Amino acid sequence: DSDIAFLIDGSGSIIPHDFRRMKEFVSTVMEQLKKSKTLFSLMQYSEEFRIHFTFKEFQNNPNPRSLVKPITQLLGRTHTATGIRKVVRELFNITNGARKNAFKILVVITDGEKFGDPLGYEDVIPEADREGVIRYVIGVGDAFRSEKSRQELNTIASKPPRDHVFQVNNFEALKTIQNQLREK
Protein backbone atom coordinates (compact mmCIF):
# COMPACT_ATOMS: atom_id res chain seq x y z
CA ASP A 1 0.00 0.00 0.00
CA SER A 2 3.04 2.34 0.19
CA ASP A 3 5.61 3.76 -2.26
CA ILE A 4 8.40 5.30 -0.22
CA ALA A 5 10.96 7.41 -2.12
CA PHE A 6 14.32 8.71 -0.82
CA LEU A 7 15.87 11.95 -2.07
CA ILE A 8 19.47 11.95 -0.88
CA ASP A 9 21.80 14.92 -0.97
CA GLY A 10 25.11 14.00 -2.64
CA SER A 11 26.39 17.57 -3.04
CA GLY A 12 29.99 18.41 -2.20
CA SER A 13 29.09 20.00 1.15
CA ILE A 14 28.06 16.50 2.29
CA ILE A 15 31.22 15.09 3.89
CA PRO A 16 32.01 11.47 2.90
CA HIS A 17 31.36 10.27 6.52
CA ASP A 18 27.88 11.82 6.33
CA PHE A 19 27.03 10.49 2.86
CA ARG A 20 27.86 6.99 4.15
CA ARG A 21 25.57 7.67 7.16
CA MET A 22 22.82 8.52 4.67
CA LYS A 23 23.29 5.20 2.89
CA GLU A 24 23.34 3.34 6.20
CA PHE A 25 20.11 5.09 7.24
CA VAL A 26 18.38 4.32 3.94
CA SER A 27 19.36 0.66 4.16
CA THR A 28 18.15 0.25 7.75
CA VAL A 29 14.79 1.90 6.96
CA MET A 30 14.18 -0.40 3.99
CA GLU A 31 15.13 -3.44 6.09
CA GLN A 32 12.92 -2.25 8.95
CA LEU A 33 9.75 -1.04 7.18
CA LYS A 34 10.02 -4.10 4.96
CA LYS A 35 6.25 -4.71 4.71
CA SER A 36 5.20 -7.05 1.84
CA LYS A 37 3.22 -4.35 0.04
CA THR A 38 5.84 -1.60 0.46
CA LEU A 39 8.14 -0.54 -2.38
CA PHE A 40 11.09 1.81 -2.26
CA SER A 41 12.80 4.12 -4.78
CA LEU A 42 15.84 6.35 -4.51
CA MET A 43 17.22 9.41 -6.31
CA GLN A 44 20.50 11.10 -5.41
CA TYR A 45 20.89 14.80 -6.19
CA SER A 46 23.48 17.61 -6.44
CA GLU A 47 23.04 19.84 -9.54
CA GLU A 48 22.53 16.54 -11.36
CA PHE A 49 20.01 13.80 -10.61
CA ARG A 50 20.53 10.05 -10.47
CA ILE A 51 17.68 7.59 -10.04
CA HIS A 52 19.52 4.65 -8.47
CA PHE A 53 16.49 2.38 -8.27
CA THR A 54 12.88 2.82 -9.30
CA PHE A 55 9.96 1.21 -7.45
CA LYS A 56 9.81 -1.30 -10.31
CA GLU A 57 13.47 -2.05 -9.84
CA PHE A 58 13.10 -2.51 -6.10
CA GLN A 59 10.15 -4.77 -6.85
CA ASN A 60 12.47 -6.88 -8.99
CA ASN A 61 15.33 -6.99 -6.48
CA PRO A 62 14.03 -6.13 -2.97
CA ASN A 63 17.51 -6.40 -1.43
CA PRO A 64 18.29 -3.03 0.28
CA ARG A 65 22.02 -3.52 0.80
CA SER A 66 22.40 -4.80 -2.78
CA LEU A 67 20.58 -1.73 -4.11
CA VAL A 68 22.36 0.73 -1.83
CA LYS A 69 25.96 -0.48 -1.75
CA PRO A 70 26.90 0.58 -5.30
CA ILE A 71 25.71 4.18 -4.75
CA THR A 72 28.58 6.66 -5.21
CA GLN A 73 28.52 10.35 -4.23
CA LEU A 74 27.84 12.77 -7.12
CA LEU A 75 29.38 15.89 -5.51
CA GLY A 76 28.54 19.31 -6.98
CA ARG A 77 25.87 21.84 -5.98
CA THR A 78 22.62 21.49 -4.01
CA HIS A 79 19.43 21.64 -6.02
CA THR A 80 17.06 20.34 -3.36
CA ALA A 81 13.91 22.10 -4.64
CA THR A 82 14.40 20.87 -8.18
CA GLY A 83 15.08 17.39 -6.73
CA ILE A 84 11.75 17.45 -4.88
CA ARG A 85 9.92 18.45 -8.07
CA LYS A 86 11.68 15.66 -10.03
CA VAL A 87 10.92 13.11 -7.32
CA VAL A 88 7.23 13.91 -7.40
CA ARG A 89 6.97 13.73 -11.22
CA GLU A 90 9.56 11.04 -11.90
CA LEU A 91 9.81 8.60 -9.00
CA PHE A 92 6.07 8.65 -8.38
CA ASN A 93 5.39 7.91 -12.01
CA ILE A 94 3.54 4.73 -12.98
CA THR A 95 6.09 4.03 -15.69
CA ASN A 96 8.65 3.79 -12.88
CA GLY A 97 6.59 1.24 -10.94
CA ALA A 98 4.68 3.64 -8.71
CA ARG A 99 1.23 2.34 -7.79
CA LYS A 100 -2.11 4.13 -8.04
CA ASN A 101 -4.07 4.20 -4.75
CA ALA A 102 -0.81 3.88 -2.82
CA PHE A 103 0.30 6.33 -0.11
CA LYS A 104 3.28 8.44 -1.28
CA ILE A 105 6.03 9.06 1.23
CA LEU A 106 9.18 11.04 0.55
CA VAL A 107 12.21 10.98 2.84
CA VAL A 108 14.55 13.90 2.06
CA ILE A 109 18.07 13.58 3.46
CA THR A 110 20.11 16.76 3.36
CA ASP A 111 22.30 19.13 5.43
CA GLY A 112 19.72 21.85 4.75
CA GLU A 113 21.83 24.08 2.55
CA LYS A 114 20.15 24.44 -0.87
CA PHE A 115 22.62 26.16 -3.20
CA GLY A 116 22.57 27.09 -6.88
CA ASP A 117 19.02 25.82 -7.46
CA PRO A 118 16.99 28.16 -9.71
CA LEU A 119 13.92 26.96 -7.76
CA GLY A 120 12.88 27.80 -4.25
CA TYR A 121 10.81 25.52 -2.01
CA GLU A 122 7.81 27.81 -2.63
CA ASP A 123 7.93 26.68 -6.26
CA VAL A 124 7.67 22.99 -5.42
CA ILE A 125 5.98 22.21 -2.12
CA PRO A 126 2.43 23.11 -3.25
CA GLU A 127 2.72 20.52 -6.02
CA ALA A 128 4.04 17.88 -3.58
CA ASP A 129 1.11 18.67 -1.26
CA ARG A 130 -1.41 18.37 -4.15
CA GLU A 131 -0.06 14.97 -5.17
CA GLY A 132 -0.32 13.80 -1.53
CA VAL A 133 3.36 13.30 -0.84
CA ILE A 134 4.02 12.99 2.93
CA ARG A 135 7.44 14.48 3.65
CA TYR A 136 9.98 13.40 6.24
CA VAL A 137 13.31 15.19 6.54
CA ILE A 138 16.52 13.69 7.89
CA GLY A 139 19.13 16.31 8.74
CA VAL A 140 22.84 15.40 8.47
CA GLY A 141 25.97 17.35 9.39
CA ASP A 142 25.39 20.79 10.90
CA ALA A 143 21.75 20.92 9.70
CA PHE A 144 20.42 21.56 13.20
CA ARG A 145 23.15 24.03 14.05
CA SER A 146 22.15 27.06 12.01
CA GLU A 147 18.99 29.12 11.84
CA LYS A 148 18.93 28.94 8.05
CA SER A 149 19.32 25.16 7.70
CA ARG A 150 16.91 24.35 10.59
CA GLN A 151 14.23 26.35 8.83
CA GLU A 152 15.05 24.77 5.50
CA LEU A 153 14.29 21.35 7.01
CA ASN A 154 11.07 22.78 8.46
CA THR A 155 10.04 24.17 5.07
CA ILE A 156 10.47 20.85 3.27
CA ALA A 157 8.77 18.71 5.97
CA SER A 158 5.03 18.05 6.04
CA LYS A 159 3.26 19.74 8.97
CA PRO A 160 3.70 19.90 11.86
CA PRO A 161 7.44 19.96 10.95
CA ARG A 162 8.52 19.03 14.50
CA ASP A 163 6.86 15.62 13.93
CA HIS A 164 8.50 15.09 10.53
CA VAL A 165 12.09 16.32 11.02
CA PHE A 166 14.76 14.05 12.51
CA GLN A 167 18.49 14.02 13.16
CA VAL A 168 20.37 11.31 11.24
CA ASN A 169 22.15 10.14 14.39
CA ASN A 170 18.94 9.83 16.38
CA PHE A 171 18.77 6.07 15.89
CA GLU A 172 15.27 6.13 17.42
CA ALA A 173 13.94 8.09 14.45
CA LEU A 174 13.17 4.97 12.37
CA LYS A 175 10.84 3.45 14.91
CA THR A 176 9.12 6.83 15.51
CA ILE A 177 8.54 7.15 11.75
CA GLN A 178 7.46 3.50 11.66
CA ASN A 179 4.95 4.27 14.44
CA GLN A 180 3.69 7.31 12.46
CA LEU A 181 3.27 5.29 9.25
CA ARG A 182 0.48 3.38 11.02
CA GLU A 183 -1.34 6.72 11.06
CA LYS A 184 -1.12 7.81 7.40
Residues forming the site for Mg ion (CB under 5 A): 11, 13, 78
For the chain, after which residues does the C atom lie more than 2.5 Å from the next written residue's N, i.e. where is it broken? Answer: none
The SS3 assignment for 13 reads coil
Residue with Cβ nearer Mg ion (15 or 174): 15
Q: How far is the CB of 44 from Mg ion (least distance, A)?
A: 12
Residue with Cβ nearer Mg ion (134 or 138): 138
What residues form DSSP beta bridges with 44? 8, 50
CA separation (Å) from 14 to 17, 109, 184?
A: 8, 10, 31
Q: How far is the CB of 36 from Mg ion (least distance, A)?
A: 36
Residue with Cβ nearer Mg ion (17 or 130): 17
Q: What would the DSSP string read from start to end of 63-120?
A: -HHHHHTT-----S-B-HHHHHHHIIIIIT-GGGTPPSS-EEEEEEEE-S--BB-S--
Q: How far is the CB of 116 from Mg ion (least distance, A)?
A: 9
Residue with Cβ nearer Mg ion (78 or 82): 78
Q: How far is the CB of 156 from Mg ion (least distance, A)?
A: 14
Residue with Cβ nearer Mg ion (13 or 38): 13
Q: How far is the CB of 63 from Mg ion (least distance, A)?
A: 29
Write down the H helix ranges in 2-53. 16-32
Rounded distance between C-alpha atoms, residue 58 and residue 83, angstroms: 20
